[PDB]
């Protein structure tokens, strides 16, 4: 049977204090009558306000990135700073950081391992580009990405890990994975984990889909066997994020 | 006469809420009897606290980095978000970001121009490494860095710019540039601005020194004709930062 689902709002590099305050008020009023972990990943600047204003007990706050250690890293935020700030969830390896900000499979893996060692719950992101998908390389790309993560973890660490599978080619392009595409990617991931890490870990692992999830398409994705919730970008800045939450019943 | 000096604290990726709040308490209680712009550049997470707590009229808050626009840039903070948050100073092109985080001369220049267009005061950092210095390439490296920044600015924009010359081989290593080394680098930078931009702009520009500035060495550096204050890393996390402020006369 499925583990507790997750509905993760990745606000990306967006928001004003007023627009996010208004959105948080809507989140606080949503009536959620099943077990689902909701996650709001704000920019670093907005963590203070989001922590203060977000009070719905089924929601937690997350960061969108970090580096492993404090020190002479002008502009970056470290895991200990986030831990001191009361943030215990983090998104790492997002496709935009892999593309834009130098995060290779190994750099992602090392960030993930450092965040687990610090005590975080980690949404570790993987996923293939349009060119990878079109040329038949989805499986080798996704498996290589997760193998790098696994290399740096031990079996018991997986209790603190969530995988987000991103159809990278669906982000911002007017495309979306079909339920069969999402299912086949999640099933591949899960089977690899079962065989490399253990059947017990694989059954408990949450694997989330990202790439144009919205209030209308969420239920049809969620009802697939190996989908445990969503990594939501654009729709998480909108009232219909609550419909995405409701789709994980 | 020299232009108004600047004492800039670059906390880098350091601090707890409590340890930084205690530094702010010290700054708030400090008596300063000359004109000096003090700047506190904290991590993004700590901006809310510093905005609420810092009250000294000679101090402003700053960010340590940004990207130009909001959007699908997971993990980053943009200029519009900082502007909405009430942050009007920013450090850009710091040596650590040039080294670790992909910031070429051109990326630094484009960030600086975007910040100036968005209304910010900008501390734009340049400086050569140990290998560049040992190779005799200090002049070509530093002049090429500032030339890239200047290509994206207009004459009027220099009123919003401050240059920080970092002796990169002196960052964190506890061995400061001698007075003569700093003065010669600063005089070279100014001569460029004078020739390329104008004698007026050159004479008003603040050129700050960074690299192991501390309470004990700051006054002697400040006596040099082309030094207009300091970009302070390690000592800005310590009580002696106040002595570095007092040294800017």
Output the domain CATH number for residue B64. Answer: 3.20.20.70
Whole-angstrom distance, CA of residue B148 vs CA of residue B128: 15
Whole-angstrom distance, CA of residue A171 vs CA of residue A227: 18
- Which chain A residues contact residue B77 at CB under 8 A? 13, 43-45
Query: Residue A34 to residues A4, A160, A228, A249, B120: CA-CA distances in angstroms?
Result: 9, 21, 14, 6, 47
Strand partners, B126: B165
A91 touches chain B (CB under 8 A): yes
Whole-angstrom distance, CA of residue B241 vs CA of residue A1: 59
Cβ-defined contact of A71 to B45 (cutoff 8 Å)? no
A99 touches chain B (CB under 8 A): no
Instruction: Using CB atoms, pick whichever of A75, A82, A102 lies closest to residue B64.
Output: A75
User: CA A144 from chain center: how many Å?
Assistant: 18
Query: Residue A7 to residues A35, A172, B138: CA-CA distances in angstroms?
Result: 11, 19, 52
Q: What are the catalytic residues of A?
A: 94, 166
Strand partners, B206: none
Contact status, residue B93 vs residue A94, Cβ threshold 8 Å: no
Q: Pick the residue from chain A with its C-alpha nearest to B62.
A: A75
Q: What is the resolution of this structure in A?
A: 1.1
Q: Which of B12, B13, B47 to mutate to test the interface with A (most CBs of A within 10 A)?
A: B13
Residues 6 or more apart whose CB falls under 8 angstroms from that of A232 comprise: A7, A8, A9, A10, A210, A213, A241, A244
Contact status, residue A207 vs residue A227, Cβ threshold 8 Å: yes
Instruction: Tell whether B12 is in a known binding site.
Output: yes
Quick count: other Cβ atoms within 10 Å of Cβ A135? Answer: 11
Residues 6 or more apart whose CB falls under 8 angstroms from that of B175 comprise: B212
Query: Residue B127 to residues A206, B88, B177: CA-CA distances in angstroms?
Result: 47, 24, 12
Contact status, residue A134 vs residue A219, Cβ threshold 8 Å: no
Q: Which residue's entry shows tokens 């970008």?
A: A233
Residues 6 or more apart whose CB falls under 8 angstroms from that of B63 comprise: B41, B44, B47, B77, B82, B87, B89, B90, B91
Closest CA to A141 of A107, A76, A189: A189
> How close A75 comes to chain B (CA, Å)?
5
Whole-angstrom distance, CA of residue A203 vs CA of residue A158: 11
- Most distant CA pair in chain B: distance in Å? 47
Q: Which of A75, A92, A115 to mutate to test the interface with B (most CBs of B within 10 A)?
A: A75
Closest CA to A225 of A179, A193, A192: A179
Cβ-defined contact of A45 to B85 (cutoff 8 Å)? yes
B157 touches chain A (CB under 8 A): no
Q: Which residue's entry shows tokens 């700053």?
A: B62
Return the number of CB contacts < 8 Å for A and B: 127
Quick count: other Cβ atoms within 10 Å of Cβ A141? Answer: 17
∠ CA B16-B17-B20, rounded to 5°: 80
- Tell me which method was used to determine the 3D structure: X-ray
Instruction: Using CB atoms, pick whichever of B48, B76, B102 lies closest to residue A48.
Output: B48
Contact status, residue A45 vs residue B81, Cβ threshold 8 Å: yes
Contact status, residue A78 vs residue A68, Cβ threshold 8 Å: yes
Whole-angstrom distance, CA of residue B123 vs CA of residue B145: 14
Domains in chain A, number: 1
Residue ranges of A 161-180 with Cβ closer than 8 A to chain B: 171-172
Quick count: other Cβ atoms within 10 Å of Cβ B81? Answer: 25
Tokens of A98: 């892999």
Closest CA to A89 of A6, A22, A29: A6
User: CA A3 from chain center: how many Å?
Assistant: 16
Q: Using alpha carbons only, how large is chain B's radius of gyration in Å? A: 17
Residues 6 or more apart whose CB falls under 8 angstroms from that of B7 comprise: B36, B37, B38, B39, B229, B230, B232, B241, B244, B245, B248
Instruction: Using CB atoms, pick whichever of B14, B48, B49 lies closest to residue A71.
Output: B14
Whole-angstrom distance, CA of residue B117 vs CA of residue B103: 19
Question: Mind giving me the DSSP string for chain A?
Answer: -PPPPEEEEE--B---HHHHHHHHHHHHT----S--EEEEE--GGGHHHHHHH---TTEEEEES--BSS-BS-TT--BHHHHHHTT--EEEES-HHHHHHS---HHHHHHHHHHHHHHT-EEEEEE---HHHHHTT-HHHHHHHHHHHHHHT--GGGGGGEEEEEE-GGGTTSS----HHHHHHHHHHHHHHHHHHT-HHHHHH-EEEEESS--TTTHHHHHTSTT--EEEESGGGGSTTHHHHHHTT-
Whole-angstrom distance, CA of residue B92 vs CA of residue A75: 9
Whole-angstrom distance, CA of residue B67 vs CA of residue B78: 5
Residues 6 or more apart whose CB falls under 8 angstroms from that of B166 comprise: B94, B95, B125, B126, B127, B210, B211, B231
- Which chain B residues contact residue A74 at CB under 8 A? 10, 12-13, 64-65, 91, 94-97
Question: Mind giving me the DSSP string for chain B?
Answer: -PPPPEEEEE--B---HHHHHHHHHHHHH----S--EEEEE--GGGHHHHHHH---TTEEEEES--BSS-BS-TT--BHHHHHHTT--EEEES-HHHHHHS---HHHHHHHHHHHHHTT-EEEEEE---HHHHHTT-HHHHHHHHHHHHHHT--GGGGGGEEEEEE-GGGSSSS-PPPHHHHHHHHHHHHHHHHHHT-HHHHHH--EEEESS--TTTHHHHHTSTT--EEEESGGGGSTTHHHHHHT--
- Which chain A residues contact residue B75 at CB under 8 A? 13, 64-65, 94, 96-97, 101
Phi, psi of A60 (to 5 degrees): -125, 160
Q: Pick the residue from chain A with its C-alpha nearest to B42.
A: A75
A13 touches chain B (CB under 8 A): yes
Tokens of B244: 């570095």
Which of B94, B96, B128, B186 is flagged as catalytic?
B94
Quick count: other Cβ atoms within 10 Å of Cβ A151? Answer: 13
Residues 6 or more apart whose CB falls under 8 angstroms from that of B72 comprise: A12, A13, A96, A171, A172, A233
Q: Using alpha carbons only, how large is chain A's radius of gyration in Å? A: 17
Determine the structural domain holding residue B219 and report its residue range: 1-249
Instruction: Tell whether B228 is in a known binding site.
Output: no
């Amino acid at each position: 049977s499925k583990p507790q689902p997750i509905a993760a709002a990745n606000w990306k590099c967006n928001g004003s204090q007023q627009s996010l305050s208004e959105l948080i008020d809507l989140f606080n009023s949503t009536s959620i009558n099943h077990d689902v972990q909701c996650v709001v990943a704000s920019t670093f600047v907005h963590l203070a306000m989001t922590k203060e204003r977000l009070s719905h007990p089924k929601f937690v706050i997350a960061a969108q990135n970090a580096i492993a250690k404090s020190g002479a890293f002008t502009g970056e935020v470290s895991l200990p700073i986030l831990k001191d700030f009361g943030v215990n969830w983090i998104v790492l390896g997002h496709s935009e950081r892999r593309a834009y900000y130098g995060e290779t499979n190994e750099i992602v893996a090392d960030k993930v391992a450092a965040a687990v060692a610090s005590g975080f719950m980690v949404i570790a992101c993987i996923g293939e580009t349009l060119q990878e998908r079109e040329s038949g390389r989805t499986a080798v790309v996704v498996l290589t990405q997760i193998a790098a993560i696994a290399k740096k973890l031990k079996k018991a660490d997986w209790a603190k890990v969530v995988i987000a599978y991103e159809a990278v080619w669906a982000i911002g392009t007017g495309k979306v994975a079909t339920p069969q595409q999402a299912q086949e990617a999640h099933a591949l991931i899960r089977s690899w984990v079962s065989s490399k890490i253990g059947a017990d870990v694989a059954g408990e692992l949450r694997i989330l889909y990202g790439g144009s999830v919205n209030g209308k398409n969420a239920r049809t994705l969620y009802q697939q066997r190996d989908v445990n919730g969503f990594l939501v970008g654009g729709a998480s800045l909108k009232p219909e994020f609550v419909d995405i939450i409701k789709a994980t019943q």
